[PDB]
Amino acid sequence: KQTARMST
Amino acid sequence: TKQTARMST
Amino acid sequence: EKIICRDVARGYENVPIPCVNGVDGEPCPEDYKYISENCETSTMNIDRNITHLQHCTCVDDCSSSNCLCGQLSIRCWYDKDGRLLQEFNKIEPPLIFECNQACSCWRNCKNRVVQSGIKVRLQLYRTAKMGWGVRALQTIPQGTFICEYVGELISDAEADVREDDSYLFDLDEVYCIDARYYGNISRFINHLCDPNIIPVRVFMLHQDLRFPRIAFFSSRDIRTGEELGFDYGDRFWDIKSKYFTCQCGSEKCKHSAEAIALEQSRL
Amino acid sequence: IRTEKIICRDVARGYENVPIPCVNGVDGEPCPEDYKYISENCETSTMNIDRNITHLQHCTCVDDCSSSNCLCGQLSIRCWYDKDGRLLQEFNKIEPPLIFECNQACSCWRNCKNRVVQSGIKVRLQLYRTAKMGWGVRALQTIPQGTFICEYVGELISDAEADVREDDSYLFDLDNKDGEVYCIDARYYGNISRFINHLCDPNIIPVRVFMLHQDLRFPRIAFFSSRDIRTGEELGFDYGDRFWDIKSKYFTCQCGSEKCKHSAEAIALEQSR
Numbered sequence: 001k002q003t004a005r006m007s008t
Numbered sequence: 009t010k011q012t013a014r015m016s017t
Numbered sequence: 018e019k020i021i022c023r024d025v026a027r028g029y030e031n032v033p034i035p036c037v038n039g040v041d042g043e044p045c046p047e048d049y050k051y052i053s054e055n056c057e058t059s060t061m062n063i064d065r066n067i068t069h070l071q072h073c074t075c076v077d078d079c080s081s082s083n084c085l086c087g088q089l090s091i092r093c094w095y096d097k098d099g100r101l102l103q104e105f106n107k108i109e110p111p112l113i114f115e116c117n118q119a120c121s122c123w124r125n126c127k128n129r130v131v132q133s134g135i136k137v138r139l140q141l142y143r144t145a146k147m148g149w150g151v152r153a154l155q156t157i158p159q160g161t162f163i164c165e166y167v168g169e170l171i172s173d174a175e176a177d178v179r180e181d182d183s184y185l186f187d188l189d190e191v192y193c194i195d196a197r198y199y200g201n202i203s204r205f206i207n208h209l210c211d212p213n214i215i216p217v218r219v220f221m222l223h224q225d226l227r228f229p230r231i232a233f234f235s236s237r238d239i240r241t242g243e244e245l246g247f248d249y250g251d252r253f254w255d256i257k258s259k260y261f262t263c264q265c266g267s268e269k270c271k272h273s274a275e276a277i278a279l280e281q282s283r284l
Numbered sequence: 285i286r287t288e289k290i291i292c293r294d295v296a297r298g299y300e301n302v303p304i305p306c307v308n309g310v311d312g313e314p315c316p317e318d319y320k321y322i323s324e325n326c327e328t329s330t331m332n333i334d335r336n337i338t339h340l341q342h343c344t345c346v347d348d349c350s351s352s353n354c355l356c357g358q359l360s361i362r363c364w365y366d367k368d369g370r371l372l373q374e375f376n377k378i379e380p381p382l383i384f385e386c387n388q389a390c391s392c393w394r395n396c397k398n399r400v401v402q403s404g405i406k407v408r409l410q411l412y413r414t415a416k417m418g419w420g421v422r423a424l425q426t427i428p429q430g431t432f433i434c435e436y437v438g439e440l441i442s443d444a445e446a447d448v449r450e451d452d453s454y455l456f457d458l459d460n461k462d463g464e465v466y467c468i469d470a471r472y473y474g475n476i477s478r479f480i481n482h483l484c485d486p487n488i489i490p491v492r493v494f495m496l497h498q499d500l501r502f503p504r505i506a507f508f509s510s511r512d513i514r515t516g517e518e519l520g521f522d523y524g525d526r527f528w529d530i531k532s533k534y535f536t537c538q539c540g541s542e543k544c545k546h547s548a549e550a551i552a553l554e555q556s557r
């Protein structure tokens with residue numbers, strides 16, 4: 001993806 | 009008017 | 018006489034609402050689902066966009082005339098204790114815009130009465146002539162918030178084909194609240210031709226004008242044990258008088274079999 | 285010696301069950317006010333969340349919902365909450381299940397055993413200034429393993445919208461898969477969880493939870509303690525590689541743990557072999 005994402 | 013009864017402010 | 022349910026709301030309200038019956042053998046009514054907030058049974062798309070909320074910038078307790086939220090009803094109509102001002106228009110009430118999650122103010126500001134819920138002790142009880150009713154178990158000063166008319170949101174067109182039209186409250190292409198299958202304690206408040214509460218349209222977490230929320234407030238000081246009741250209005254009685262007439266027993270009664278018979282003698 | 289100052293009595297402005305104060309004993313930074321505190325998720329475009337009350341799976345319990353006959357419990361194999369509202373010791377802390385709490389369609393009461401997250405914040409937390417990681421949140425009390433801490437609250441946005449957001453420090457993906465998936469952005473609108481830092485040695489875990497609706501596109505993100513937490517400890521979770529694979533170019537981890545996987549040193553060493 002293009003942006004950072006917190007995720008489980 | 010309407011078919012059913014309606015309470016109102 | 019007998020205490021038959023310790024809390025009809027099953028802990029959903031701020032306080033318990035007991036039910037008693039000292040009149041007859043009718044058991045606690047359970048042919049509905051108690052809900053504390055309005056529910057949806059079709060696609061309504063209530064506008065909850067936070068950026069559509071008009072909101073204030075107050076850094077005090079929103080007790081000043083500069084509160085933008087107050088100004089949306091010409092002024093805030095709540096006094097310092099959360100009660101409608103003496104001069105509030107009880108016949109054609111204004112629309113009340115409470116403060117909301119976009120406002121800069123705190124949760125305890127002075128313009129948040131309805132959203133903070135039920136505070137007065139109420140009882141569901143069996144009446145003599147009008148089935149189940151709601152009464153006060155304390156004294157209630159004039160202007161005190163009592164409860165909201167909570168139920169199932171439906172369209173006008175759905176409201177026209179509902180088989181049971183005893184629990185429909187018009188919001189204003191109008192929408193309706195039907196408390197038949199889903200509702201709260203307000204579903205049990207009866208019509209009085211001598212009323213002690215009034216319905217007021219209120220906005221809180223959203224400002225979708227199709228879906229005002231219906232708040233009851235006391236229109237006078239109420240004594241412990243008094244039945245609560247409002248004027249259902251002519252959109253109700255014009256249709257319902259065909260099936261039954263008013264049993265409120267007031268000398269001002271406008272909807273009894275007698276009053277209608279006397280009025281037909283219009284010649 | 286710089287004094288610790290109390291700079292906000294309650295960053296939640298009365299919206300939580302408890303106050304959440306803010307202190308600073310490190311530098312001159314005043315209380316952060318570049319965002320809007322909200323206690324519940326918000327929308328800024330139409331999400332058409334399924335709120336139809338008749339779509340709810342719901343239980344027929346007349347207990348406090350502690351039996352194995354609670355349909356709500358069964359929807360996550362069993363109810364994972366103990367008599368005090370804490371996750372059972374056997375809870376899968378690596379791949380947590382989806383939790384379905386009881387709702388308005390259930391026959392049970394509001395104080396049944398399957399309503400923890402919907403009852404809100406109960407532990408005492410504090411926003412404070414850390415040495416190296418800006419603002420963080422710490423505990424003001426001991427917190428036993430399995431206790432609900434707070435929800436990750438913010439602005440619900442689409443995956444495509446998340447892909448064009450300028451600030452990507454507060455994006456939490458609700459689902460890891462392709463397709464019609466959503467994200468919470470806590471940059472502009474958020475609650476206390478927006479300030480929780482990454483730790484390579486975490487003490488809280490995110491768990492997907494359903495409460496007033498069961499639209500599977502919009503789980504709510506509940507943090508629970510993954511171990512007993514001591515008074516004064518900073519709270520932290522593992523943000524994951526979908527974060528660090530992008531962010532490591534801009535900054536590196538300052539958590540200071542021997543197990544750190546994202547410090548300049550851990551990264552430089554991996555680059556070597």
Ligand SMILES: C[S@@+](CC[C@H](N)C(=O)[O-])C[C@H]1O[C@@H](n2cnc3c(N)ncnc32)[C@H](O)[C@@H]1O
Pocket residue numbers: 146147148149150183184204205206207208209261262263264265
């Ligand atoms: C909204 S419900 C109120 C609760 C109702 N008494 C009950 O037992 O469910 C409205 C219905 O209550 C009864 N009712 C309410 N006020 C009345 C009145 N003033 N006279 C006669 N019946 C009344 C009628 O059956 C009316 O259709």
Ligand SMILES: C[S@@+](CC[C@H](N)C(=O)[O-])C[C@H]1O[C@@H](n2cnc3c(N)ncnc32)[C@H](O)[C@@H]1O
Pocket residue numbers: 416417418419420452453454478479480481482483531535536537538539
């Ligand atoms: C969700 S915010 C956390 C609150 C933030 N520290 C603040 O002052 O608002 C995430 C951002 O905080 C910083 N951060 C969080 N964990 C970090 C860590 N382990 N090392 C360095 N910076 C961290 C990064 O700037 C990251 O993009």
Ligand SMILES: [Zn+2]
Pocket residue numbers: 073074075078079084085086087116120122
């Ligand atoms: Zn204001």
Ligand SMILES: [Zn+2]
Pocket residue numbers: 073075078079086116117120122123126127128
């Ligand atoms: Zn206010």
Ligand SMILES: [Zn+2]
Pocket residue numbers: 072073074079084085086115116117120121122128
């Ligand atoms: Zn306001």
Ligand SMILES: [Zn+2]
Pocket residue numbers: 209210211263264265266267269270271272273
């Ligand atoms: Zn009457």
Ligand SMILES: [Zn+2]
Pocket residue numbers: 343344345348349353354355356357386390392
């Ligand atoms: Zn149950």
Ligand SMILES: [Zn+2]
Pocket residue numbers: 343345348349356386387390392393396397398
């Ligand atoms: Zn339950």
Ligand SMILES: [Zn+2]
Pocket residue numbers: 342343344349354355356385386387390391392398
């Ligand atoms: Zn349930």
Ligand SMILES: [Zn+2]
Pocket residue numbers: 483484485537538539540541543544545546547
């Ligand atoms: Zn680290």
